[PDB]
Amino acid sequence: MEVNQLGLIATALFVLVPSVFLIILYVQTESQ
Amino acid sequence: MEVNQLGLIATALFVLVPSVFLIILYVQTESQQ
Amino acid sequence: SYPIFTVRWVAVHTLAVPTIFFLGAIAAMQFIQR
Amino acid sequence: DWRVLVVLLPVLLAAGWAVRNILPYAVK
Amino acid sequence: RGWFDILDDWLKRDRFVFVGWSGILLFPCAYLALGGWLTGTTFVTSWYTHGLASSYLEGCNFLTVAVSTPANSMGHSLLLLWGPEAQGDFTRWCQLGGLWTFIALHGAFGLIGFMLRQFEIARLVGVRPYNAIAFSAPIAVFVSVFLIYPLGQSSWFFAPSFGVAAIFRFLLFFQGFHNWTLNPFHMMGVAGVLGGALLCAIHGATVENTLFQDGEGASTFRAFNPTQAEETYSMVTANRFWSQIFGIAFSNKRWLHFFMLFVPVTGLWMSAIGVVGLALNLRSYDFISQEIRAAEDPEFETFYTKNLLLNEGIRAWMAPQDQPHENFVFPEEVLPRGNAL
Amino acid sequence: TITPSLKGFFIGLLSGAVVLGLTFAVLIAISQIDKVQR
Amino acid sequence: GTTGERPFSDIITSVRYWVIHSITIPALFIAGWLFVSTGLAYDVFGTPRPDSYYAQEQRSIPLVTDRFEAKQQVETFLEQLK
Amino acid sequence: ARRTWLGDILRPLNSEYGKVAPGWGTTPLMAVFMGLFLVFLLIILEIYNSTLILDGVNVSWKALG
Amino acid sequence: PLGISGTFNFMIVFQAEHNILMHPFHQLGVAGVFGGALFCAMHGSLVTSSLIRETTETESANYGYKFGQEEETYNIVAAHGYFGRLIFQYASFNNSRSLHFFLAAWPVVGVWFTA
Amino acid sequence: MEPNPNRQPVELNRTSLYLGLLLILVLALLFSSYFFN
Amino acid sequence: DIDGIREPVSGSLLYGNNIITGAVVPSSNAIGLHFYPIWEAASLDEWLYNGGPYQLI
Amino acid sequence: GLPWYRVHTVLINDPGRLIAAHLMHTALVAGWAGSMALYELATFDPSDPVLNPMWRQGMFVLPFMARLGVTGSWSGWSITGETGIDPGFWSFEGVALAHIVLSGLLFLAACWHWVYWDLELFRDPRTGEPALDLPKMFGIHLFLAGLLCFGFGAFHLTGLFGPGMWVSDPYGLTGSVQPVAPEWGPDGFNPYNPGGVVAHHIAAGIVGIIAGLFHILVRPPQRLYKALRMGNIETVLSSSIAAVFFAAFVVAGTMWYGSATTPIELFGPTRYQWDSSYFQQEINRRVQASLASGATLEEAWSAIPEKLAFYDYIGNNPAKGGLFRTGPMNKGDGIAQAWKGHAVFRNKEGEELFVRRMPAFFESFPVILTDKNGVVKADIPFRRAESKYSFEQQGVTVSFYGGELNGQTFTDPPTVKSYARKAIFGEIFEFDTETLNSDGIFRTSPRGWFTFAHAVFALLFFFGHIWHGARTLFRDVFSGIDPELSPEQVEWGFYQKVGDVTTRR
Amino acid sequence: METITYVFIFACIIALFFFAIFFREPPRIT
Ligand code: CLA
Ligand code: CLA
Ligand code: CLA
Ligand code: CLA
Ligand SMILES: CCCCCCCCCCCCCCCC(=O)OC[C@H](COP(=O)(O)OC[C@@H](O)CO)OC(=O)CCCCCCCCCCCCCCC
Ligand SMILES: CC1=C(/C=C/C(C)=C/C=C/C(C)=C/C=C/C=C(C)/C=C/C=C(C)/C=C/C2=C(C)CCCC2(C)C)C(C)(C)CCC1
Ligand SMILES: CC1=C(/C=C/C(C)=C/C=C/C(C)=C/C=C/C=C(C)/C=C/C=C(C)/C=C/C2=C(C)CCCC2(C)C)C(C)(C)CCC1
Ligand SMILES: CCCCCCCCCCCCCCCCCC(=O)O
Ligand SMILES: [Fe+2]
């Protein structure tokens, strides 16, 4: 299918960036 | 130029995934002390 | 009381002896003409 | 052939001379 | 108190040249690798394998002598003295390139021997074995360049020959055929070797210029006692200097000396991996996107396209003589040439 | 059947055994004469 | 700080050392010389003499092209000169 | 620690930690097999290499019939 | 050129016009740079080998050095005793000032020549 | 059943972060040309 | 035009280069060893074609 | 706390969670396999095993499934080109699904073993400290490895109970899965003899059963136990890595040179087949045989199977790729459609000429035409002004026999030069460059990519061997050397034997 | 897209230099 090339990077970062944000906050909560 | 289309995401993840791993480890180190 | 023949003695001569011989052969080589 | 003993005589004479000069102190 | 333990005693005695169990592998192989090279560079031709003179006997000097690789027709034969090719004739063995495998294989086992010596002496003396670990980099380079690489190609013929100028030709072959300079594993290797030399010079300089005054003489070497407890130079002043000169400096003497191990060892390992790829002609020869643009657009020129023209010159001009078994005959008119030259 | 190269193989096998065996013979001799004192 | 062997500086300043080694050293140098001046080194090692790289009217390398006839091939080439 | 039915059945198989045969035990015999295997690996290597050539052993694709 | 591939162009054309590989001052340069990488790794491996135990297995050995401490952090006599035996005694330094000067001099001089 | 006694905290100091980010970024700057090709 | 033969060489990322192939290209052979500051050029366009940044840098 | 490069050392004395980690690793590996198969199935074109086989398509796990007897899809196709077959459950799809189910089950067992780490099974009964009796574990696992090795040779490969394995003729034309009988003679060590692979697994499996039994029942000598620190699980890691890197060098080599277990119909040809003109010799053989029995030229070349012509083409030589030229070979020269036929060049005197073939070393190569005695007779010149051998001057013509261009002749010089340029690559093929948007630059095959990965991993694992071996033999000084090392022990001559404090003088 | 990527990575390296110099772990004597 002739989808949008940048769709993959947009979906990848949409997931990656905010998820990583939460993981960073969660992990540094446990280690204190 | 006619560059490889997956070069971009290859590069973005090559930067992002290892960098994020170090950031996680650093921040939870700093909040131990 | 020092020994003469040692592992050291052997290791030295093992290099020194063929080196002088080769030096001699190479020196003879400078007088070779075509 | 003959060139082999010509190449070999200084070696053996050298070993000879060195054997008979060091022999007293090697026996000790 | 059996024979093994009596023999252990004798191998591990403290003598001018330590022997050890590892000496049984090391010392014959080191000496035969060394002996072979001096023998071949003095007396042995490369006429029948390469069409080359390569000994002092034949007229070559230190820069042009080599123990050259066997002919391409030998494939990857071990070329054992008693093997099907030489059939025990020492003279023929020499003319077919037997001293190349002899030197390569004994050298390989000697390198194992030397690394085992590092382990052996380290265990007896009670230090950690990081010098052995560091030596893995030279081993990787040797086996990757002298053994893996030609095993991926047609024959031993294309390994390096053991000679100053023959190695120079190896350098240029890799440029022309593999475009090896464009390879990021080689680039990491360069950074590691040049970074190593940097770190060597800058650490030596720093220490010698942050010395404490510990005697009265103008020569500061005398004022060090090898069993003093005190550091002999000021880490604090060195750290301030580089902080204000360069922005960052070392503060941990252990990290510093670990980093000096890490930089060149890693670089060599990285270059080794690139060479493994070149065994298979898996090069970083080209950038596809530049070639598509350049093919369509004759006004597009980069330093990248300029270097490939150079490579093309190298191949066409050196191949007939460097690969004589191929019987390349290139008429004057097929040779690539710029104007006038 | 028993080809030249297999004959040569045994030749290299025996040559090597001689070399290793002669070498260990000598090292065992020397170690026995020149012991350490404990 | 020594392991028992005689010091080198002590050995090579000694008369006996030089009494032995002023014979051995020239003898080896002469032997290696004779290895070359006699022409023996050519024959042992198989190295071409200045006149035996090519046949008279030949400008082709005598290149070994066979793995298992290699030995024979070299010998065939050498005949082309005798 | 936790006991389980499978743990009890396997238990004897993890119960001789540290047990050694005295001295050199079977070391001489082990070295005999190490020697045999070396020669055996040599032969395999020199066949693949065409250093060792055997009758009716054509080290070629044309040995696929 | 101020570029990565331009650097290579420069090297190649320099080799055709000057045969730099056959020039002794470049060969000393290679000896300076190869030798410096070698001595870099040696000196780093020798010091690391002879660190004095100051930490447990669960922590970087590096926390055994505290910036500005007075005592040395490794045992140079154990390093010298290791390296002296690996080669022979008088091929290994016991003087740290001579050692570090040697580390400075080798690559500096080899690069002077190549320059 | 008790808590597992083999756990340990893990650490990464600020300098190690700086060194690690620098490695990754430089590695990325070197290989990106080859990924785009 | 590094070699002064009106054969311009593209060095920059925006003109089709990557990190590995890019360069600031040496000044023109037509210039030789002549000093080529900006103010000796008729225009910045001229200075750019002829390699003036290399000298400044 | 722990540095980042040591986080997994927390398992060294925790057999439960060690098993948990090994299960998760095993889950991930088997998950990979299943995902890789499903991806290859979704992109594989099964419709032309002759000119678009799996190895032109960038397929990596498919040939390993086919090598042991999985050859068909639930979809009805097989890789040998038969159609309407029914593969039963062990299709490519079913194998992929099995690995995925296996992966999920391993994952759950990993969870259980992580939570219930404190099993009494792992405790030494006399001390209550966790302990693993490595020597006996070695015998158990070795015995099991022997049974499996034996069973795989004796049942799967023989077809006694299982499908056998991929075998082919020497030119990769007629491959199938067949039961193989063991070759018990010395030819069983011939790497190209499929029967030796059978005899190997049988005989080695019996040796493995026997050795396993010895290691279950005989305790290690005290001398060896102490030398190799056999109470330390990290010595197993050290020796296991060494065995694992030895194995990786072997599979790299046999993939590159070829053996009975790396058939060319699953991985493509080897570079050595181009170097020795292996398929070209066979092709000329068949044509001469046709000609001597009264076939015409057109007839003799028309009988050449296209599959054999395709092997005689440098595009399929795995030593013609690049590290960063990605994807399937078809992305380079295109999807091959048809053999165009065999080009024959003649000069104006009716002499047959021969294009000098590109050697694998050269990214580019000049176009040089020789006579049967190797003498240059035409070329494509670089400098025109002093050319003697241009196609124009020598009147070079090309004629095609067999294939899509059979019986046609071209004489206008630029067309003839065009086919001469292709002829340096061996036999000439029609490609579809449009469907994959092929860029025209040669890529390596799965033979090359596998050899490259495995040789590199092998070398890296050598270093892991060295590291973990060092850590085992020097565990006591890992954290630094003794801070009471008195200088008499490392100074010269104090001791007769280096390190032995009882040899003081 | 490739140009933006190269300049982005370069720009992050410069930012990192700023942080590594001015927001370093200060070295403290013992
Ligand atoms: C530690 C020493 C050492 C080592 C590792 C090697 C290793 C090697 N040498 Mg070198 N060599 C050595 C010392 C050594 N050499 C010495 C001292 C000399 C001078 C005397 C030479 C002279 C030499 C030559 C001239 C050549 C080699 C070659 C080789 C290679 C082939 C070896 C081979 O096939 O062995 C095969 C033999 C064995 C592996 C023997 C193993 C013994 C096993 C364990 C038992 C055998 C049982 C026995 C046969 C039965 C006895 C029978 C009795 C009961 C009647 C290999 C790289 C060849 C080479 O480089 O080719 C290019 C070659 O031509 N070597
Ligand atoms: C019921 C078990 C089972 C079965 C039948 C299969 C079957 C298959 N797998 Mg799967 N696999 C399994 C479990 C299983 N798998 C598990 C548990 C995992 C996770 C680790 C995987 C991971 C996996 C991968 C990653 C891949 C497969 C693939 C395959 C296929 C090819 C297998 C092959 O080439 O073996 C290769 C055989 C070997 C590597 C054996 C060499 C073993 C060494 C030499 C032995 C070491 C020495 C020994 C210990 C000591 C010597 C003893 C001696 C004296 C006897 C085949 C369809 C391939 C495929 O096509 O996937 C779609 C593939 O790429 N499998
Ligand atoms: C042994 C491993 C292996 C091998 C040999 C192959 C082989 C192949 N794969 Mg498969 N694959 C594998 C593992 C493997 N795969 C795994 C693990 C995955 C999941 C990620 C895949 C996913 C996959 C997909 C999705 C596709 C393939 C495809 C292909 C084909 C083309 C590959 C290509 O272009 O490579 C390119 C290789 C490179 C560009 C090399 C990059 C490696 C870089 C240089 C290393 C990183 C540098 C490192 C950071 C160094 C610094 C460290 C140090 C300083 C500390 C080929 C048959 C393609 C195909 O044709 O499918 C049909 C395809 O589309 N593969
Ligand atoms: C069977 C293989 C195997 C196993 C089980 C281990 C296990 C171990 N190693 Mg060893 N090692 C191996 C192979 C192996 N290693 C190899 C091949 C090398 C050479 C490259 C090394 C080099 C090595 C060093 C130098 C060190 C260890 C250390 C360790 C210990 C801590 C590891 C850790 O916490 O990592 C934590 C690692 C991470 C958090 C991230 C690493 C990510 C890497 C850079 C890339 C990712 C790879 C990819 C995701 C998956 C692999 C794909 C492919 C390999 C299959 C642990 C006992 C450490 C040690 O001894 O501590 C006491 C240590 O310092 N290992
Ligand atoms: C550029 C190199 C400089 C690095 C050295 C750093 C300083 C070292 C010395 C510090 C104090 C010096 C005191 C002055 C003393 C001095 O500097 O040392 C010179 C030394 C003199 O020692 P003697 O034993 O003669 O006497 C003891 C003396 O120390 C008393 O004056 O002689 C040698 O060491 C010669 C070695 C060649 C021996 C050849 C043996 C053959 C080698 C064996 C095969 C190789 C080994 C195999 C390994 C794999
Ligand atoms: C191979 C072989 C073998 C072996 C052999 C040997 C072991 C040999 C040796 C040899 C040797 C052992 C030799 C040596 C030589 C040397 C030389 C030739 C040297 C030279 C030197 C020089 C020339 C130098 C100079 C100088 C300078 C330049 C500067 C400073 C000073 C001086 C003086 C140092 C055998 C028998 C087994 C048999 C088989 C084969
Ligand atoms: C849970 C469960 C389940 C499910 C399952 C699943 C869903 C699975 C999946 C899984 C999977 C799906 C997995 C996969 C995986 C993957 C992997 C693991 C991969 C890896 C990768 C890698 C590691 C890579 C690397 C690299 C890169 C990236 C680049 C190049 C180089 C290299 C290759 C190195 C069931 C239902 C059964 C049942 C119940 C339970
Ligand atoms: C493992 C230790 C390696 C020791 C092996 C060294 C080899 C000793 C040299 C043997 C060379 C003599 C054989 C030449 C005669 C062979 C004649 C023939 O091919 O039939
Ligand atoms: Fe230092």
Side-chain angles (χ1 to χ4, degrees), chain L residues 280-464:
Chain L
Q280 177 188 44
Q281 265 153 13
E282 178 54 16
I283 287 168
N284 293 330
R285 203 189 60 68
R286 302 187 179 208
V287 172
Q288 306 294 251
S290 285
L291 284 188
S293 68
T296 78
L297 208 57
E298 290 73 4
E299 288 173 321
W301 282 101
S302 289
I304 296 302
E306 293 202 331
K307 197 178 193 172
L308 182 65
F310 200 45
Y311 284 132
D312 201 30
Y313 159 66
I314 210 179
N316 294 327
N317 176 341
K320 285 295 306 184
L323 185 53
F324 290 99
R325 304 173 184 163
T326 58
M329 291 169 109
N330 290 332
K331 180 60 193 203
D333 46 9
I335 309 167
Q337 304 297 303
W339 184 39
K340 283 187 171 168
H342 176 77
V344 163
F345 299 93
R346 301 173 182 108
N347 59 20
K348 64 178 140 194
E349 276 134 51
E351 275 203 283
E352 165 157 50
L353 308 176
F354 300 103
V355 189
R356 183 59 198 259
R357 277 180 180 198
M358 165 180 259
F361 251 136
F362 293 75
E363 294 289 337
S364 67
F365 195 75
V367 177
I368 297 185
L369 289 66
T370 216
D371 68 357
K372 59 188 169 194
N373 331 310
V375 167
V376 169
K377 296 272 174 85
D379 52 45
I380 298 178
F382 201 95
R383 277 183 179 172
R384 258 47 157 234
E386 257 159 84
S387 9
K388 315 301 186 167
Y389 303 107
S390 67
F391 282 30
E392 291 82 348
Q393 288 165 299
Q394 300 297 324
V396 167
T397 54
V398 58
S399 306
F400 285 90
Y401 304 92
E404 217 62 35
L405 296 178
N406 166 83
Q408 304 182 213
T409 290
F410 304 89
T411 59
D412 62 315
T415 303
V416 176
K417 298 189 255 189
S418 194
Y419 290 114
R421 290 198 212 91
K422 297 320 172 174
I424 68 165
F425 306 144
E427 280 295 328
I428 297 181
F429 284 86
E430 175 71 50
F431 297 80
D432 171 1
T433 57
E434 315 290 350
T435 297
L436 296 182
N437 197 339
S438 301
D439 54 33
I441 311 193
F442 292 122
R443 280 156 175 88
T444 197
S445 73
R447 197 170 291 272
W449 276 119
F450 174 103
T451 307
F452 170 71
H454 279 79
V456 171
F457 287 152
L459 201 68
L460 287 172
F461 268 63
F462 169 63
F463 179 88

Side-chain angles (χ1 to χ4, degrees), chain L residues 24-25 27-36 97-108 457:
Chain L
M24 187 64 71
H25 183 272
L28 302 174
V29 182
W32 175 77
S35 297
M36 193 74 256
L97 130 72
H99 280 82
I100 281 145
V101 175
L102 178 62
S103 170
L105 291 184
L106 293 172
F107 170 84
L108 295 164
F457 287 152

Side-chain angles (χ1 to χ4, degrees), chain M residues 6-25:
Chain M
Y6 301 140
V7 166
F8 174 83
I9 299 172
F10 170 87
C12 296
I13 294 166
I14 295 293
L16 169 72
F17 289 172
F18 172 78
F19 283 102
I21 291 165
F22 297 97
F23 300 106
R24 55 167 188 178
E25 273 173 325

Side-chain angles (χ1 to χ4, degrees), chain E residues 199-263:
Chain E
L199 285 173
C200 190
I202 202 155
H203 177 57
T206 301
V207 163
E208 284 302 284
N209 290 282
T210 53
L211 295 172
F212 288 116
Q213 182 172 1
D214 278 336
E216 329 172 322
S219 148
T220 58
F221 295 111
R222 281 123 149 181
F224 178 81
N225 184 27
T227 50
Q228 72 187 54
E230 305 77 358
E231 68 173 340
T232 199
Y233 67 93
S234 170
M235 181 77 24
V236 168
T237 278
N239 165 277
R240 175 124 182 169
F241 176 80
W242 287 114
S243 288
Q244 296 183 275
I245 286 309
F246 184 59
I248 57 102
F250 287 99
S251 72
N252 188 294
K253 232 155 167 326
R254 289 172 175 222
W255 171 240
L256 193 158
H257 284 92
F258 178 77
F259 194 71
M260 299 178 67
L261 174 172
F262 176 94
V263 166

